[PDB]
Nucleic acid binder design. Structure first.
Lengths: 66, 116, 78, 181
RNA sequence: ACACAUGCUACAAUGGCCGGUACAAAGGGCUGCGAUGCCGUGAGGUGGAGCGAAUCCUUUCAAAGCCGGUCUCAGUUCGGAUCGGGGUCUGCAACUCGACCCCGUGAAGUCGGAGUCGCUAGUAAUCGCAGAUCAGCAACGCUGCGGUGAAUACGUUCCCG
């Protein structure tokens, strides 16, 4: 590592809304990150919703209901 | 502030700050801000991250947004352009779909002008 | 949003077609309804006035009225 | 902290389970991340002189390294190039910088991108290296979202000791990196 | 793919949006106009008071106006085209081709080159209202009704008849 050219590299404490907390080295001067994302990926859920999204024959039978 | 995926501005009221997302206009802002409880007069600088939490969970839970709406529609337009409809033909040729005037106006579908 | 149309002549013909499990090209006058999903699979010779165009009906056709899987106007420009 | 967190779990769990999955029969044979290099874009060289210092600054404070400015091998005429113009810098990460960058992006950068469905498993080379595209930026909470006028994108490469490709799929699957069949 | 012509909505603060509130004129109505009430977010649905109408219905009728709050000059709380989903009504039937409502979507457009048009007082300008045709409507059209309401005319040299 060279001395003076690299930015300061500090410990941090990352917190999400649910409180699931992370401790890392980082570049932030604040020493913390107040984030809205945790290790709760929505791809698993988003993908399911997207898969669920198609199919309209049923919807038509919906309007017509007999 | 940050929300569902739209970067909120510096100084806007909440019933306008919610509007900058693809799924929300003015009326959805007047119904979302009535259901959740955030004052519509609140600026974006004065917004709370817990208000981002409750508001965010509400409007991803009970309403659809950017990716759903867009690759969402854009699956319905390509749906009617695959099956061979007449509105499919209008989306093919680049013409107005509602069967409206094509002789003089409907320049917003043909676009920029070439003159012969 | 209540009782949708139905094309009663095509309705009588369609039922006969699917009871016997027979599929036949149909010269059809009707431009007005693809009413039930009972019409799925039947080939419709749609009549734009001048000739009959064969149209296969699949699951996505439900909710599009029958005539404009065949267009009535012709345009090229040059 | 004796071990970075990703490496805290890597030094026991992913290695023991990856031996479970593949019977190399030899310790030591057992893939791990070598470097994480972060190529940088631009292509505005010749067209605009000022931005590349925007990219030097950009690579830095996403991770804390001074990106080394990498320039043109040759002047190729159509896309205005000139031998020796700066066209994007890159930063090579290895060790504590590699792992702290990885865990942070993993638990921070990947979830935020709008409509972030996943990452393709297909994007390997012949030998187990994974590269994917960050089109805009501001996936990172290190960059303040009003400091940032135009979006500077970047490639991020993970380079492993994976002699195959499903070796690297298996590592980067067990390591907390997303994918989507 | 185009080019012309008459209109309408605009490009914002003399403005937009929310709340409160005051004032018209004329008209229209039988297999028509249809109230209170109830169901809807809203087009509307259910129901039929009462009227062939200075009586009943079109609500006691308006909108611009006034009082108040918010927005702070920005491609925006300007602008509504377009497009997606979801509906209602009319009709045997809304695909080619109806209007209206709801949710989203949110483009051009920063007062407009040469040229050119209208208007001399309740006029111009702007604001709603009704009617005929009509089951429904392409009505921003046409014919009318009223509301608020200016500037300028030195004068025949010049253009037009």
């Amino acid at each position: 590592m060279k001395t003076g050219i690299h930015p300061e590299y500090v410990d941090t404490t990352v917190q999400c809304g649910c409180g699931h907390s992370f401790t890392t080295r980082s570049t932030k001067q604040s020493g913390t990150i107040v984030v809205e994302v945790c290790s709760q990926c929505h791809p698993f859920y988003t993908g399911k919703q997207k898969i669920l999204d198609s199919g309209g024959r049923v919807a038509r039978f919906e309007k017509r209901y007999g | 502030a940050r929300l569902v995926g739209v970067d909120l501005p510096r100084d806007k009221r909440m019933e306008i700050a919610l509007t900058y997302i693809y799924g929300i206009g003015r009326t959805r802002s007047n119904e979302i801000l009535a259901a959740t409880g955030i004052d519509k007069n609140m600026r974006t600088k004065d917004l709370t991250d817990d208000q981002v939490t409750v508001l965010r969970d509400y409007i991803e839970g009970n309403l659809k947004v950017e990716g759903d709406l867009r690759r969402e529609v854009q699956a319905d337009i390509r749906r009617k352009i695959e099956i061979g409809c007449y509105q499919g033909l209008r989306h093919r040729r680049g013409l107005p779909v509602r069967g409206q005037r094509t002789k003089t106006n409907a320049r917003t579908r043909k676009g920029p002008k070439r003159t012969i | 949003k209540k009782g949708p149309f139905v094309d009663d002549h095509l309705l009588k013909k369609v039922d006969v077609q699917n009871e016997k499990n027979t599929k036949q090209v149909i010269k059809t006058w009707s431009r007005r309804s693809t009413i039930i999903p009972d019409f799925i699979g039947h080939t419709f010779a749609v009549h734009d006035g001048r000739k009959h165009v064969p149209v296969f009906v699949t699951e996505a056709m439900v909710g599009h009225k029958l005539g404009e899987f065949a267009p009535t106007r012709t345009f090229k420009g040059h | 902290k004796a071990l970075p967190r990703l490496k805290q779990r890597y030094r026991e769990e992913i290695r023991e389970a990856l031996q479970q999955e593949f019977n190399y029969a030899n310790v030591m044979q057992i893939p791990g991340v070598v470097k994480v290099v972060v190529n940088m874009g631009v292509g505005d060289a010749a067209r605009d002189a000022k931005l590349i210092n925007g990219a030097i600054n950009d690579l830095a404070l996403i991770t804390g390294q001074k990106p080394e400015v990498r320039r043109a091998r040759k002047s190729i005429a159509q896309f205005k190039l000139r031998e020796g113009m700066p066209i994007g810098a890159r930063v090579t990460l290895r060790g504590d910088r590699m792992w702290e960058f990885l865990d942070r992006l993993i638990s921070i950068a990947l979830p935020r991108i709008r409509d972030f469905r996943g990452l393709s498993p297909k994007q390997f080379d012949g030998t187990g290296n994974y590269t994917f595209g960050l089109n805009e930026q501001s996936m990172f909470h290190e960059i303040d979202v009003d400091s940032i006028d135009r979006p500077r994108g970047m490639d991020i490469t993970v380079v492993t000791t994976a002699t195959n490709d499903a070796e690297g799929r298996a590592l980067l699957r067990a390591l907390g990196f997303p994918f989507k069949e």
